[PDB]
Amino acid sequence: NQQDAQINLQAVKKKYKEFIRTFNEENFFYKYRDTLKRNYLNGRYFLEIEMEDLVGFDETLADKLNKQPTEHLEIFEEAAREVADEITAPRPEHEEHMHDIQILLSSNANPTNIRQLKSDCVSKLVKIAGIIVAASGISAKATRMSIQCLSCSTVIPNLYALPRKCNTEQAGRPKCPLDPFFIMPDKCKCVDFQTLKLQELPDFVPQGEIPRHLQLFCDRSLCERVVPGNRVLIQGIYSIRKVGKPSRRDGREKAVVGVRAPYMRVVGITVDSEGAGAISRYSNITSDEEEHFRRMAASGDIYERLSQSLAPSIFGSRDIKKAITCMLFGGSRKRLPDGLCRRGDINVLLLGDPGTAKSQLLKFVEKVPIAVYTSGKGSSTASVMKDPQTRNFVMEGAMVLADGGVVCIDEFDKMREDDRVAIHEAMEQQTISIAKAGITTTLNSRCSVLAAANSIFGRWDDTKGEENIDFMPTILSRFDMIFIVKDIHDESRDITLAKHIINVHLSSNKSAPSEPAEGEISLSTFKKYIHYCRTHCGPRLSEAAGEKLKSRYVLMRSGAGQQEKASDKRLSIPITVRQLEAVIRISESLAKIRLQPFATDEHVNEALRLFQVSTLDAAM
Amino acid sequence: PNYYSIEDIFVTQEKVECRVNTKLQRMGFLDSGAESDDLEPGRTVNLPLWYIKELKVNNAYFTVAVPDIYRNVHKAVCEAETTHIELGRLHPYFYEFGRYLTPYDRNHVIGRIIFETLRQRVRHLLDISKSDGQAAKAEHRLDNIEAKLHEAGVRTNSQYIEWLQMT
Amino acid sequence: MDPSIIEFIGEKCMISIIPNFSNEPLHLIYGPVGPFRAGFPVFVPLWMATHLRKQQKCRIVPPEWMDMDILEEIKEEEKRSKFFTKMPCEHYMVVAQLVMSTAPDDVPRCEELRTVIKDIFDIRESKLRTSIDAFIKGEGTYAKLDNLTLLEIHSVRPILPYSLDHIARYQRTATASQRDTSMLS
Amino acid sequence: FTQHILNQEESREPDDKRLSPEETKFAQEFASNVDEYFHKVATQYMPNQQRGEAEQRIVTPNLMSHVFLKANVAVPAVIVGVDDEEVDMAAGSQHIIPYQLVADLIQNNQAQLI
Amino acid sequence: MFGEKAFDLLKELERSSQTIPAFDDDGVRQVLEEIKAIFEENVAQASSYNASGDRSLWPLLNFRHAALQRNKRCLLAYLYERCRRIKALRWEFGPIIPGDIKQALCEPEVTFFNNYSKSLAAYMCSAGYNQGLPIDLTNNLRPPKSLYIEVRCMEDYGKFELDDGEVIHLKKNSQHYLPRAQVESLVRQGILHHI
Amino acid sequence: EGEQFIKDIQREYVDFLDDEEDQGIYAGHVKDMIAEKSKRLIVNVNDLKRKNPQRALGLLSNAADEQLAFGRALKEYASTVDPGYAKMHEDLFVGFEGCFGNRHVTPRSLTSIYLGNMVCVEGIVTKVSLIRPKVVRSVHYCPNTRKVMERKYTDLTSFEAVPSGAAYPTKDEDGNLLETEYGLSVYKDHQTLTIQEMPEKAPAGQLPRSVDIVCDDDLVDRCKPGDRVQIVGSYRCLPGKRGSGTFRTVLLANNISLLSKESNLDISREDIMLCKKLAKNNDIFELLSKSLAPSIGHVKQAILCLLLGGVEKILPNGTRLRGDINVLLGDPSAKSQLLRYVLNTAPRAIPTTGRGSSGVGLTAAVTTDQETGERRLEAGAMVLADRGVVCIDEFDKMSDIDRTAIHEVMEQGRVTISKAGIHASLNARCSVLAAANPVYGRYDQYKTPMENIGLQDSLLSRFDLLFVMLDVIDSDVDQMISDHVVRMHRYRNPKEADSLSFVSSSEEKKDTEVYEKYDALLHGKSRQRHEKILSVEFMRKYIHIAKCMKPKLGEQACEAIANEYSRLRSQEAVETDVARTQPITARTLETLIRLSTAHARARMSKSVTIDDAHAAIELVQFAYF
Ligand SMILES: Nc1ncnc2c1ncn2[C@@H]1O[C@H](COP(=O)(O)OP(=O)(O)OP(=O)(O)O)[C@@H](O)[C@H]1O
Ligand SMILES: Nc1ncnc2c1ncn2[C@@H]1O[C@H](COP(=O)(O)OP(=O)(O)OP(=O)(O)O)[C@@H](O)[C@H]1O
Ligand SMILES: Nc1ncnc2c1ncn2[C@@H]1O[C@H](COP(=O)(O)OP(=O)(O)O)[C@@H](O)[C@H]1O
């Protein structure tokens, strides 16, 4: 303790200790004491902090905080427990024992990029923004422990040398040298450890290259914090694990001089707000939000407004779009005490002439909570690898990443059939099976899928009869609403398409006069709205809906069979149990939107007219 | 006519697994018509509370009768687990059932269990003293008698805040 | 139970202040009021210095318990106050707020002061959680007020009791009813 | 409490002590209103026995809402009118209890509420 | 639904919090078709030798009883909270500015509205002065201040300001010849959080 | 003997053995006077709290030697009670068991706490592994001096301390003789395995995590990997952790709950009596027909006999044959959901993929520095279904490599198999299903019976019957199926004269309003049944004895099988079904034998009847008739 500067004491002595007692505004909210105590009450053991309060307090710490944060951010912990344990006393009688805590940091300074995380930027606090891939399980770590040889809780600065002398020396002259250390984990501790991960951005030198990435670290409360495939804002720190320059040159033919490895640990991850950047699992949403939600649900002019949410630069296809979003909400996983988990999620088909904006539309359906896109030639056999550490046979197993999300693809036609069958199947039972190596783990996950396609011979097949698909009718089976795409001519239509997109395509046009349309706004809102509305309501039918829908499917199959007989040959699609079993999910999607649980058949006449497109499509 | 409440009639409804000792007649609201003015000594039955609220705990038209949650085994180990017996919503109200049902046991245990359970709330809401943040916290291990005071204590803090300065 | 209902109780209390008038466009009220002369103290309630200081009419001074050493020793006595402690005016948690809004234009040391009042408030409250942590067997004939203040107790009031009736009905029925060998409800 | 408040009043019809007369006009006016409102519900078949102000219809009978009491008397246990064990009474203290048992001291004004 | 609908019946008031468009007389018609749908059965066995007095009916008495219990006391709430809300806003104003509509009067609430207003009127007469000063209690909290000017508002509807003006247009910019007794009714039923 | 509260704690456990509770029940006739000698006693903490909560929850926070002391005090007690069993001079650890509920986390949630605790797990039996012995102490001897010393050794996985490190002695005094006597030098049993979350609570946006387990002597390998399990034990963490490199965990101190048996049932000879009382009822077969598939027309009359494995038939040092049954047929839309009526209804039910390499039945046994010297080993995916049946989907989509690899043990009903490292063989005499598709969808009857399927005609004799499954409707039946399917849609959703609500009671309730979602019984009690006679549990409680009973042949079988097989091979290859008369062979006899063998177990009639003849032929003709 060399009390001149950089001292162990001055900070903790009063400064950090009193910063919070001193942190004041009237309204008598403006401390971190209340938040701390009320956090403690519910087992949290943390609190949230800024980094530009020091400017609110002083002008010295921060330019010293950046320099040796590893120490300051534990002096913070000690000050925290001593300033909070006084309040742990209601009187001296109900600190049954103290406890350890974790601090947070945050700011709005600016995000950096991985291409610059360099030797200067090391041991130093920072901010970035990347994206997540996958990260480990939850192993272990602790802080100290005792040993029978000395019986002292072994205290450490770093988060190993174990010296010579015995300490069971009280044996006479017959002592026990040469490191006799019996670790006593009756006396040890336990914190968490998870190894988060990080990929770089999609616009920041991937151009003539590929994107690199980084692996991470945590201690106590940031496990169970991040599920992968997410956009983060971060404050962490860039540091190493090993050390050395001189001619103790590494390995066998490694390390010309001194190369040690990278990583970062987190001091105060947060998340993103790309509209709703991070709204996927947790709830920091507030009562105003939910009022907004239900009062828009109360609004009986929400669905047709939502027919105009994906096409603010696109014209037409409105009867086409009355259920392009109903796909998103999902209906009901109405499972039963026997096996019959009748199919939850929902699936759609579309195929027709190019030049009609299928690609951009599916890009947008990815845009608007969780989803992915490849298409053909290749998300997901599922993956049984063999761990290069220890050589065990683990399962990465990537429809797992639609375990509640959805999927979109075109290019079902343009990829061969060695890889269609596991996915032919998954989307009738949702259980990814496995039987390959010594494991029988019938995995599962609730994904949907969107299916675009391309018919060879175009509208020729569509004019006359049966050249609809090139591959099979068993995946003509699994889908409910199935859509031709033509580009039939009309000069009015032509000119209107003409100016419609040019007025789009001119000067990055519609910034000001775009959103002035009615209520067709904020796909961000839709992320949140969806992740809400699916997460509560579990509706199912009303009695009056069932008989008319039943009779309607009856007449559907009778008309298909009559067209079979009105041509003296099969002129139908197979009248399946799946068709009713899916239109039920269309009713369910509708009731999911308006939040009314019990749905009536007028609510679903809309469904009738929408799958009527498929009926009258495969009518010929 | 009740210990009144907006929950005025979550009162006389809880269905049971009531057995039979003797004959019965004309079950009425069951599958019954002009079909059975006679039935067996011994048949488990689901039954409301209202007509049986006043049917002679001494007399045996019906019998020793408990629900299975209300059977004593879990309830016994929950006077030993009167510390973290967890509820949820499979039995959302679990607090004043005996506040009718106790004398119909013929084994004299119910009320002791229950009183111990809520002496635990004499110990429990030590932690409940504030409204820290956004909408909802822990809102499904709840009978809807604790719901009331829960909201209430929340409000108490909520307005204490506006006191805390001009706020 | 409110933020202001207790100021109909608390804010009626008095200090003595200094105005800058003598007796005003009116002299004096038929009342306990003192004669008005500037440059000298006068005793008033504290629902008016509010009205007056911000009307730019007066100065003001506090009581004496609004200090340091009293509010440095009351706390350490209060530490091992297994029950309660010194009580300077017994609702100083409301006087101090309506004090420290404006008067800190010229009050001294209005910050370490606030520090201590919070430091005492929280602890006494927290004590008033753990009193509950012994309450067994329906002890609704045994309790503590002995040097309580009121601004702490109304923060509990509606919660427990509207429950405690049907809570300890099982045992309050005991010294009020009868049955066979077992406990009654 | 328009239910059995009337019943204590027909027990004595106290002077300005218990209740006041305009309250009585108010209250019987109201109870007439409730009945002549129920008029337009079921009054071809208004209650065939429990017809007027009824027998099980009660509102405010309960007298054990356990309230806080303020000491003001002999700082020893000045043992006085209450059913419970008010042993250990005092002057600046409290040992909290129900209310039924003391509708006495506060009509004496020996004690007070908080 | 078997004695649950009141959750739906006061759901008439679902948006009517303080952003209220208007109100109606819901939830009586088919449901009080019950009360006469049932007395037939409830008194079907009335003084009959159909059983000559045995145990058998003993639920059925109670069936009637609980049916009625639910009915009547649901109804008690259905008017009672309506009295409560109207009383609150009528503590924000006298019967100067009556209800939003005066069309959600379920007929016997003639009796009830008028009864409550005038029971309180009687109590008023006792109150204030022995003769009775209906004494301003919850509005026009100007200390001794101006008498005759108009001010700015926040978009009221209801249009009930009869008081002393030709037309003051009781909304935002209700700005006309406004005296004091003109402007004597509304403080927080939705206007002048802002002059 | 550490801090002297240990002995206070010893006698606090001795204070268990006072009166009716333990002096009456728990001490005496409990392991040794009953003589099964399980040193692991049965404790339940709750009684200990009812004596000394300082010893109840002082245990579930610290277990340094409270267990050691418990076992010590117990052995000293029985040393007083019964010196006959005083020859087991060891710790004799105890249970501390229970279906209590203090803290019962997942393998996911042994999360940086619980260290130094005694808690619960649930999860999957997996990696049921190899055995070894362990060292206790060595009874040496010196013929030079006739001196038998001794030396016990420890390590952390057993208790806290570690041996004062050294190997077994030699010339330990000065040069005299050290003859290591074995047999007196003793050994326990050891074991090591892991568990996974029975996972379906797992968030498949996330990874279902793993655990680490150790066991010991009288606990050794008590179920098979492929089952469901709950367990309750204590926890420890030995390794270095940057003092040297990070940290790991382990679990022990435990007793088991396997939670899927029938012998778990408190079984008298009364359950058999209920079965045999109702056994005489003749048309119960049709009830079991409508039993397992109550949520779907359609078969299962026959599928039962797969579900019953089969019947054993061996000859005097001659041969043996495999007793079991196997069939399958259909365009999409109840085929692909008639397979999960087994995965989650009946035991020993392990579905396979349709896409599987090197462990559909293989192992491949690849190894990397096991704790022991296992150079080559793994296990497979068939013995999991030994003595029963199996599911698959996408069979026609299966490889035509391993199809023949099925035929191996399927047709043999034997294993003589290996992966070229060691010849291996056993008796796995299993059945199986899979799924199916015509290569083009809607075709199996117009063009041909065969060749709308397109594969080897060799298997069709390996299986039992050519069969049929189709989908069409005429003008009249459509509304009949409509009302059937709408019964499906309503007898599943709950809750189905001027005013009829506001009934004496309502939905307003305390604790029996809606359990999950209610169901009807109206007119399925016109079907005079009950939810217990037609159920899961009484059904499965009639599994075991039909598997124990063995209905031998009658005599009238022979002329009938003769006449019927005669006409079968006469004129089954005519009348529009000739190309579906390809696989006729001398194999319908043994399947008929399995048929009547099974059906004579469904009422357990150790006998044979002509009615069974009709029952076992009529399905075969109904294939097409
Ligand atoms: N009707 C339209 N209105 C506005 N823009 C359109 C329209 N049709 C096409 N476009 C534009 O033309 C481009 C079409 O490319 P896209 O990738 O959709 O082809 P496609 O329709 O998917 O054909 P294919 O399915 O064969 O790939 C998009 O960038 C889209 O913005
Ligand atoms: N009678 C029935 N019994 C059971 N399920 C039925 C019945 N009728 C219709 N269904 C339902 O209709 C859906 C039809 O899908 P199905 O499982 O038959 O496809 P699949 O048999 O797997 O097709 P494939 O045989 O080509 O794989 C299923 O979800 C099934 O539950
Ligand atoms: N001549 C025969 N002698 C003995 N068994 C025969 C004879 N012909 C048919 N069988 C039947 O055939 C079975 C063995 O036939 P197998 O060799 O499997 O036929 P495949 O050559 O088609 O596989 C026996 O179980 C027996 O029931």
Automatic annotation (TrEMBL), chain B:
Residues 80-164 form the GINS subunit domain. Residues 128-155 form a coiled coil. GO terms for biological process: DNA replication. It comes from the Eukaryota. It is found in: Nucleus. One of its GO terms (cellular component) is GINS complex. The keyword Coiled coil applies. Keywords: Coiled coil, DNA replication, Nucleus. Residues 4-55 form the DNA replication complex GINS protein PSF3 N-terminal domain. The keyword Coiled coil applies. Component of the GINS complex. Belongs to the GINS3/PSF3 family. The GINS complex plays an essential role in the initiation of DNA replication. Required for correct functioning of the GINS complex, a complex that plays an essential role in the initiation of DNA replication, and progression of DNA replication forks. GINS complex is a core component of CDC45-MCM-GINS (CMG) helicase, the molecular machine that unwinds template DNA during replication, and around which the replisome is built. This is DNA replication complex GINS protein PSF3. The gene is Psf3.
From TrEMBL, chain D:
Keywords: Chromosome, DNA replication, Nucleus. The keyword Nucleus applies. This is DNA replication complex GINS protein SLD5. Residues 61-114 form the DNA replication complex GINS protein SLD5 C-terminal domain. It is found in: Chromosome; Nucleus. One of its GO terms (biological process) is mitotic cell cycle. One of its GO terms (cellular component) is GINS complex. Belongs to the GINS4/SLD5 family. The GINS complex plays an essential role in the initiation of DNA replication. The keyword Nucleus applies.
From TrEMBL, chain E:
Residues 145-195 form the DNA replication complex GINS protein PSF1 C-terminal domain. Gene3D superfamilies: 1.20.58.1030. Pfam families: PSF1_C, Sld5. GO terms for cellular component: CMG complex; GINS complex. Keywords: DNA replication, Nucleus. One of its GO terms (biological process) is DNA replication initiation. CDD domains: GINS_A_psf1, GINS_B_Psf1. Its main location: nucleus. The keyword Zinc-finger does not apply. It is found in: Nucleus. Coiled coil: none annotated. Residues 36-126 form the GINS subunit domain. Belongs to the GINS1/PSF1 family. Component of the GINS complex. Required for correct functioning of the GINS complex, a complex that plays an essential role in the initiation of DNA replication, and progression of DNA replication forks. GINS complex seems to bind preferentially to single-stranded DNA. This is DNA replication complex GINS protein PSF1. The lineage of its organism: Eukaryota, Metazoa, Ecdysozoa, Arthropoda, Hexapoda.
